[PDB]
Design a protein around this ligand. Sequence first.
Ligand SMILES: CC1(C)S[C@H]([C@H](NC(=O)[C@H](N)c2ccccc2)C(=O)O)N[C@H]1C(=O)O
Ligand SMILES: [Cl-]
Ligand SMILES: [Cl-]
Ligand SMILES: [Cl-]
Ligand SMILES: [Cl-]
Ligand code: NA
Ligand SMILES: [Zn+2]
Ligand SMILES: [Zn+2]
Length: 240
Amino acid sequence: IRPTIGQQMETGDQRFGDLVFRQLAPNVWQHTSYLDMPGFGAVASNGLIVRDGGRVLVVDTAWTDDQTAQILNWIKQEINLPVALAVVTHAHQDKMGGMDALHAAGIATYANALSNQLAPQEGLVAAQHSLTFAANGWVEPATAPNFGPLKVFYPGPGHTSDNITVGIDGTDIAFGGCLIKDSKAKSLGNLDDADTEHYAASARAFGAAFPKASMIVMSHSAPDSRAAITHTARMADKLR
Ligand SMILES: CC1(C)S[C@H]([C@H](NC(=O)[C@H](N)c2ccccc2)C(=O)O)N[C@H]1C(=O)O
Ligand SMILES: [Cl-]
Ligand SMILES: [Cl-]
Ligand SMILES: [Cl-]
Ligand SMILES: [Cl-]
Ligand code: NA
Ligand SMILES: [Zn+2]
Ligand SMILES: [Zn+2]
């Protein structure tokens, strides 16, 4: 039950197969999957599940196809509405490891064009659709058709050059993915593929994109305050 990296079990977490689901809002769930790193233990990765009327929107895969299938299973059981689309927040295993499971389920997948271009080099499957972004980082609306409350924002390079973020419009929830670390984080996680020059501005950009989101959901920590953004940014300031 207990990851080395990620939030531990708390009451109101629902354990379903190998995954954990935490209701954040009437219409928003966090999905948590665990990659058993040999010798390091389980690494939690969080995405989101959003009910938008008669359809469900997914943010990020699990680490694996098998885990992402369990997410669909959980959605089927708990919401029992079709998954309209998945948005995946950059081309790394924690965010796009389960693309095949979404595709096999006939779920329309969207990623940053650059994530799609990077997917093959990262041993991953591209999303079937490419999000492009304006100079101010907002998704080009035509590339994000019928996204409902998923408000996609490319904050700039940080965790990766392709990392994107998702505000859940009509909620106080914004999703920073692996760009954002919790307010008590000692580390910015894996900086291997990171843009250390732009990280801070990108963390802040995310904050300013979703100025009214009080609940910040991220890949490897329990949903947190805006302090997650500000702390991530302050840590990122040291990188320059
Ligand atoms: C949680 C991480 C430290 S690992 C993860 C990602 N890495 C992977 O998905 C790798 N496939 C992986 C290899 C070994 C152990 C865990 C993940 C990355 O490089 O951002 N995201 C990192 C992050 O968000 O900082
Ligand atoms: Cl709620
Ligand atoms: Cl503008
Ligand atoms: Cl906002
Ligand atoms: Cl700090
Ligand atoms: Na890489
Ligand atoms: Zn990553
Ligand atoms: Zn990550």
